[PDB]
Design an enzyme around this catalytic site. Structure first.
Site, PDB file in Angstrom:
ATOM      1  N   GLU A 184      10.366  -5.370   4.886  1.00  0.00           N
ATOM      2  CA  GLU A 184      10.204  -7.029   3.805  1.00  0.00           C
ATOM      3  C   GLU A 184      10.055  -6.953   3.234  1.00  0.00           C
ATOM      4  O   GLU A 184      10.823  -7.670   2.614  1.00  0.00           O
ATOM      5  CB  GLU A 184       9.199  -7.355   5.491  1.00  0.00           C
ATOM      6  CG  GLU A 184       9.827  -7.310   6.670  1.00  0.00           C
ATOM      7  CD  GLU A 184       9.604  -6.482   7.410  1.00  0.00           C
ATOM      8  OE1 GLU A 184       9.181  -7.232   9.005  1.00  0.00           O
ATOM      9  OE2 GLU A 184       8.822  -5.106   7.305  1.00  0.00           O
ATOM     10  N   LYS A 243       0.672  -0.852  -0.151  1.00  0.00           N
ATOM     11  CA  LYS A 243       0.314   0.574  -0.316  1.00  0.00           C
ATOM     12  C   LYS A 243       1.008   1.363  -0.221  1.00  0.00           C
ATOM     13  O   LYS A 243       0.439   1.989  -0.776  1.00  0.00           O
ATOM     14  CB  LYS A 243      -0.757  -0.085   1.715  1.00  0.00           C
ATOM     15  CG  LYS A 243      -1.751   0.895   1.034  1.00  0.00           C
ATOM     16  CD  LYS A 243      -2.676   1.415   2.399  1.00  0.00           C
ATOM     17  CE  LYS A 243      -4.025   2.052   2.509  1.00  0.00           C
ATOM     18  NZ  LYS A 243      -4.833   2.015   3.700  1.00  0.00           N
ATOM     19  N   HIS A 245      -7.059 -34.739  18.212  1.00  0.00           N
ATOM     20  CA  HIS A 245      -6.240 -35.391  17.869  1.00  0.00           C
ATOM     21  C   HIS A 245      -5.155 -34.306  18.965  1.00  0.00           C
ATOM     22  O   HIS A 245      -4.065 -34.717  19.470  1.00  0.00           O
ATOM     23  CB  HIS A 245      -5.703 -36.053  17.295  1.00  0.00           C
ATOM     24  CG  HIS A 245      -6.642 -37.057  16.428  1.00  0.00           C
ATOM     25  ND1 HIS A 245      -6.649 -38.709  16.520  1.00  0.00           N
ATOM     26  CD2 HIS A 245      -7.268 -36.255  15.238  1.00  0.00           C
ATOM     27  CE1 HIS A 245      -8.003 -38.774  15.485  1.00  0.00           C
ATOM     28  NE2 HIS A 245      -8.291 -37.803  14.923  1.00  0.00           N
ATOM     29  N   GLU A 257      -5.934  -7.281  15.506  1.00  0.00           N
ATOM     30  CA  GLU A 257      -5.281  -5.801  14.532  1.00  0.00           C
ATOM     31  C   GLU A 257      -6.627  -5.581  14.810  1.00  0.00           C
ATOM     32  O   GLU A 257      -6.241  -4.162  14.715  1.00  0.00           O
ATOM     33  CB  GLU A 257      -4.901  -6.367  13.257  1.00  0.00           C
ATOM     34  CG  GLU A 257      -3.728  -5.444  12.646  1.00  0.00           C
ATOM     35  CD  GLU A 257      -3.903  -5.634  11.449  1.00  0.00           C
ATOM     36  OE1 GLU A 257      -3.050  -4.277  11.034  1.00  0.00           O
ATOM     37  OE2 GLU A 257      -3.148  -6.134  10.982  1.00  0.00           O
ATOM     38  N   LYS A 316       7.249  -1.020  12.838  1.00  0.00           N
ATOM     39  CA  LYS A 316       7.721  -0.403  10.961  1.00  0.00           C
ATOM     40  C   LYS A 316       8.682   0.623  10.892  1.00  0.00           C
ATOM     41  O   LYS A 316       9.388   0.910  10.401  1.00  0.00           O
ATOM     42  CB  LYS A 316       6.963  -0.151   9.998  1.00  0.00           C
ATOM     43  CG  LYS A 316       5.601  -0.958   9.683  1.00  0.00           C
ATOM     44  CD  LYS A 316       4.880  -0.701   8.564  1.00  0.00           C
ATOM     45  CE  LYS A 316       3.308  -1.234   8.145  1.00  0.00           C
ATOM     46  NZ  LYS A 316       2.896  -0.505   6.884  1.00  0.00           N
ATOM     47  N   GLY A 323      -5.338  -2.811   4.883  1.00  0.00           N
ATOM     48  CA  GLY A 323      -4.022  -3.609   4.668  1.00  0.00           C
ATOM     49  C   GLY A 323      -5.076  -5.524   4.603  1.00  0.00           C
ATOM     50  O   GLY A 323      -5.237  -5.899   4.245  1.00  0.00           O
ATOM     51  N   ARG A 324      -5.382  -5.409   5.970  1.00  0.00           N
ATOM     52  CA  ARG A 324      -6.433  -6.587   6.504  1.00  0.00           C
ATOM     53  C   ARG A 324      -7.666  -6.805   6.035  1.00  0.00           C
ATOM     54  O   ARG A 324      -8.342  -7.863   6.749  1.00  0.00           O
ATOM     55  CB  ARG A 324      -6.349  -6.754   7.653  1.00  0.00           C
ATOM     56  CG  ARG A 324      -7.299  -5.527   9.014  1.00  0.00           C
ATOM     57  CD  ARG A 324      -6.937  -5.466  10.477  1.00  0.00           C
ATOM     58  NE  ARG A 324      -7.346  -4.312  10.919  1.00  0.00           N
ATOM     59  CZ  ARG A 324      -6.744  -3.147  11.112  1.00  0.00           C
ATOM     60  NH1 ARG A 324      -5.350  -2.948  10.827  1.00  0.00           N
ATOM     61  NH2 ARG A 324      -7.531  -2.196  11.599  1.00  0.00           N
TER      62      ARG A 324
END
Ligand SMILES: O=C(O)[C@@H](O)[C@H](O)[C@H](O)COP(=O)(O)O
Ligand SMILES: O=C(O)[C@@H](O)[C@H](O)[C@H](O)COP(=O)(O)O
EC number: 5.3.1.9
Lengths: 555, 555
Positions: free
Chosen positions: A216, A210, A388, A357, A518, A271-272
């Site tokens: 990263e 964005k 399990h 978030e 960030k 973003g999410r």
């Protein structure tokens, strides 16, 4: 906070402290043969049915009424309209929240600052399909003339998990679609092992960011280009192997990507909540644009359901208020999401981000510190695997854990004439039944009484084999996991998250903790270089840095 | 329950009640320059170092002393010896608990029912090695004379997750090994998508099942065999493409596999602690036996450390007691495991099973119902990704979440001259630092002012950008993630789980909820056949079944 002083909220808490613990699911069902009929909701989308069975929850008609009253007294409906109309509800960043516009298939205008946003939304979509068509048909050639065989999305967080989770969930709908890869972690291992299986001449990279400044992603993008400019040689080729999804044209072009190869979205796209935008390009490339539009259409259907349905029969609202009940009244820290579907193996993880978030906040929209709990810790793994493992604690631990069980009626792979899916469905059903019913001391005793043990041995083992039950669950069943239905399911939870944020009066669309992240690394990065010890931080940070420097070259 | 009646526990509880909420990390470090040195532990394994920095925890010397006194008065040491000596501490199933015998490289005798179990442990290992050498060298041929190119493990829970997580974590050490696949879910999608990419002539199936009766595994095994025979035709060829890891010789023979092709383990090998046994065959096949022996050796080193080290400097004991502090004193429901390593992408999920299935209990060894919390909900995803998602809630939510941050100093992929790893390390360090320090109103105010924000803008944004910090974390740093170090790390957490189980006086090695789950579905399976409605269950179970039957036909 606006919440704890709210009359409907106080009424709910008062009721719970007096009757909360007394509520017993097994007793409720054994005394009301109509429980399912009254505590379930069926939705016909015209593209499959979705059954939300919320009857195995610790609620009564009275409880539900108090919860719906709270949603109303907290202004859920007004807040909803504000979001759909493009109002800048994301107060801290002064932005609109319009992921709903991204999938507004009805094209009804949504004005944000003078002009309707739909035109630009549909323009990117058309641009996406056009590009997607070129790549798929083998029209878009690599720098040496070969067709693209692999698409690698490079992004992190909101620019990664959505497309990853959806492509994984819709694998059955990928044809003459190129293989799709997702690189996200800065950890060199991620891009390294990914690039090792790729041919530079037939690989297309999608840089999803964005802002287009995330360390990263930009670092991985630069590494990918070097790996490319490697076997390619000559930076004019890049244009044929690198495209971008962003809102910052300057940064993109600055990276070496022509304006025509940039698919943009907007600031009102969190973003999410971005897989519905240009960010979903990897999805369209993988399953085709028709299926991508189905995905969007499914979400649009759920958006309409959420906007036009009376709260009492509103899916996302019901899910949200039940959550409020467990969080604010029972005090449950977590929410489990258990899809009985291997394709949905990244589903719980996706909402772990989307939910946490969004609502992992402690400051109200007015700036006041909350004095109540907010967002829960979301987690889970597809079944039956979990049965399990961690279900042991769900069944016999000391924690109350609301669980959402999900499953499609029809499988994408009806092998062995449906034997596998039949067993999957049976476990799906038997587990929630058992969590509700449990197994009393008497039932366990009678079972062991038939073992030939005796009062000595039956005794030592009996309590260990007793299940107190009364573990609440929601069962969400849908006809088939298609692009449309997946879209509706995701939008359903997006709105659940929205409703809860409104009740808590927090901003579910900003993320200052993520923004903080960030900027944190920058200070430490340069200090790692060299063997000289660091002493500018707290002793722990210093000590870790010095241990790292010491062990860095150890053989 | 024994815990609440324990004197050392009440003293700890009292101390927490009177000062617990007063502890502040930033203040503790600001007033103590020797904190790191005093609350950290370095382990030199002779094959890499492991630094356990537990200084960023809400503890003081006094708290640690009280916590260690508790471990002592709850009999941790005596319990530890009982496990290592082969006593049947698994009281409910009356079995020994000897995963430590599986990796007992020193070969010191462990009598179980009058017979040293080491000879048998070593016999299976030698058998595993001989078999894998034949497979890897190409000596072992398929029914058409081809070498094996793919190995498929079919199992679920304890017979799946360990091998899966370890093979993923040790990918760099798999050179020369066949591709490994893991099929576990009964969901038909899992085996179908796996078989689709396999060639019957070069595929070897490993049926991993302690009991060899688990429905998912046997059904998957039968489907794989049918698939196989569809090409091989001759059922005598199954002996060259199917092997089994089990304790049930009868059922293995019943399935159709010959004895010499059955790699055995024993009842004292818990599924969630079985990767060290024959269950780890796929691991050995993937990275070779030398690497597999290093993995066992790492665990053996940690076992010795746990057994011979005074409690105060004992890694698993320290981790365990810090957990007791957060669980029984602060009341934290969860424990996050955050590895800054892409190879460890299934590490958190592995311990989600190992921890929760072990300590998700509510009945003590004496039969008393606990009146305190037991095992926490374990969750997590690799770093840095989480920083862009759920870390938002860890930083600004309303839940206290202990976090274990893990990372190797040396990366397996030092691309870009180590740039990627440098950034990863910087993030690892800066995140725990920020969780600890936070950012006060003053600090945030100064930043906003420096950014040129007007009084209005600053006033409305300020509160939202404040971080209260005081979020406790453990930082576990190791020289490199090798087979040996991985082994030590897993064993370390296995013992943390053990210690907590002893403190709570529960049986960390049975799993009645899991045993119950493997029988629950049988009753409903046959009821799904047909179109007639079901009415033999509660109204919810009935309603769901009928919806499923109705939608089974929908097109
Ligand atoms: O959810 C967020 O806001 C983050 O996870 C971002 O999506 C992630 O940091 C990527 O940001 P960007 O797309 O600007 O690179
Ligand atoms: O942890 C357990 O005990 C379960 O997850 C079992 O491992 C799983 O049910 C497989 O059991 P089996 O190996 O007998 O097939």
């Amino acid at each position: 906070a606006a919440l704890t002083r709210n009359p409907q909220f106080q009424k709910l808490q008062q009721w719970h402290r007096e009757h909360g613990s007394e509520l017993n699911l097994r007793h409720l069902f054994d005394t009301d043969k109509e429980r399912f009929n009254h505590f379930s909701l069926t939705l016909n989308t015209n593209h499959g049915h979705i059954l939300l069975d919320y009857s195995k929850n610790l609620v009564t008609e009275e409880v539900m009424h108090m919860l719906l009253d709270l949603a109303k007294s907290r202004g859920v409906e007004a807040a909803r309209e504000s979001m759909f109309n493009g109002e800048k509800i994301n107060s801290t960043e002064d932005r609109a929240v319009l992921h709903v516009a991204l999938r507004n298939r009805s094209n009804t205008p949504i004005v944000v600052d003078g002009k309707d946003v739909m035109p630009e939304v549909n323009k990117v979509l058309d641009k996406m399909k056009a590009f997607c068509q070129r790549v798929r048909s083998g029209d878009w050639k690599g720098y040496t003339g070969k067709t693209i065989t692999d698409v690698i999305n490079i992004g992190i967080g909101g620019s990664d998990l959505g497309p990853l989770m959806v492509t994984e969930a819709l694998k059955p709908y990928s044809s003459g679609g190129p293989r799709v890869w997702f690189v996200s972690n800065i950890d060199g291992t991620h891009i390294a092992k990914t690039l090792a299986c790729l041919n530079p001449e037939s690989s297309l990279f999608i840089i999803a960011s964005k802002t287009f400044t995330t360390q990263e992603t930009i670092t991985n993008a630069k590494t990918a280009k070097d790996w490319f400019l490697l076997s390619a040689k000559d930076p004019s080729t890049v244009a044929k192997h690198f495209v971008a999804l962003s809102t910052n044209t300057a940064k993109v072009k600055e990276f070496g990507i022509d304006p025509q190869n940039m698919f943009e979205f907007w600031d009102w796209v969190g973003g999410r909540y971005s897989l519905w935008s240009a960010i979903g390009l990897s999805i369209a490339l993988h399953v085709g644009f028709d299926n991508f539009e189905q995905l969007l259409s499914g979400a649009h259907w759920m958006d309409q359901h959420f906007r036009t349905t009376p709260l009492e029969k509103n899916a996302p609202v019901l899910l949200a208020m039940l959550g409020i009940w467990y969080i604010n009244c029972f005090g449950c820290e977590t929410q489990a999401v258990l899809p009985y579907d291997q394709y949905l193996h990244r589903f719980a993880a996706y909402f772990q981000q989307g939910d946490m978030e969004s609502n992992g906040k402690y400051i109200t929209k007015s700036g006041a510190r909350v004095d109540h709990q907010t967002g829960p810790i979301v987690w889970g793994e597809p079944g039956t695997n979990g049965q399990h493992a961690f279900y042991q604690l769900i069944h016999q631990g000391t924690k109350m854990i609301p669980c959402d069980f999900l499953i499609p009626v029809q499988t994408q792979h009806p092998i062995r004439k449906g034997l596998h899916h039949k067993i999957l469905l049976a476990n799906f059903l038997a587990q929630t039944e058992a969590l509700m019913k449990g197994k009393s001391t008497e039932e366990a005793r009678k079972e062991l009484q038939a073992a030939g043990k005796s009062p000595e041995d039956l005794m030592k083992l009996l309590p260990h084999k007793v299940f107190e039950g009364n573990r609440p669950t929601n069962s969400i069943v849908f006809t088939k996991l298609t692009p449309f239905i997946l879209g509706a399911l995701i939008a359903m939870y997006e709105h659940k998250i929205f409703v809860q944020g409104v009740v808590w009066d927090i901003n579910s669309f900003d993320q200052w903790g993520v923004e903080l992240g960030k900027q944190l690394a920058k200070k430490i990065e340069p200090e790692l270089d060299g063997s000289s010890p660091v002493t500018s931080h707290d002793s722990s940070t210093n000590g870790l840095i010095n241990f790292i420097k010491q062990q860095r070259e150890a053989k």
